[PDB]
Design a protein around this ligand. Structure first.
Ligand code: CL
Ligand code: NA
Ligand code: NA
Length: 166
């Protein structure tokens, strides 16, 4: 695709949809995911109840409640099975396919939060980048970080990718 790394509150992201690290149970929990449920409303989590449960590595889509976005894409990285880079690579790949299917234009990823979870951050970020760059250019993606520092670190990675890809 085409990604832009920034520091912000994804619940403030104006666009079509936001993407968040999830557990295949689709049960919204800690950190920013909670902000989502907080800003969005009971609609989000309840949509998940109805949807049911999925497979780690896959993603599911719900409304965004009050959020400025139309949808919330839930990439499953842990749950019935332990999380891992391939669990991230896959989950991330599905999240994108979801948006494509929905024919979306703008989508933001929560950055490295519930995406790491014990794994090497520098690694997660990279496998996550690569997948995003494989996504259709009809997609304008934004990597939103809580902290400006990580925002640069992503920019540093994003640059390393563009370098060895001529
Ligand atoms: Cl695995
Ligand atoms: Na979380
Ligand atoms: Na909304």
């Amino acid at each position: 695709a085409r990604i832009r790394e920034v520091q912000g509150d994804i619940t403030e992201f104006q666009g079509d949809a936001i993407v968040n690290a999830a557990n295949n149970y689709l049960k919204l929990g800690a950190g920013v995911a909670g902000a989502i449920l907080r800003k969005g409303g009971p609609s989000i989590q309840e949509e998940c109840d109805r949807i049911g449960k999925i497979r780690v590595g896959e993603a599911a889509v719900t409304g965004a409640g009050n959020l400025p976005v139309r949808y919330v894409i839930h990439a499953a990285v842990l749950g019935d099975e332990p999380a891992s880079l391939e669990t991230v690579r896959k989950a991330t790949k599905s999240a994108l396919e979801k948006a494509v299917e929905l024919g979306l234009k703008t989508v933001a990823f929560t950055a490295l939060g519930a995406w790491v979870g014990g794994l090497p951050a520098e690694a997660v970020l990279r496998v996550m980048l690569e997948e995003i760059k494989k996504a259709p250019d009809t997609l304008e993606v934004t990597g939103v970080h809580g902290t400006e520092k990580s925002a640069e670190a992503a920019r540093r990675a994003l640059l390393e990718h563009h370098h060895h890809h001529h």
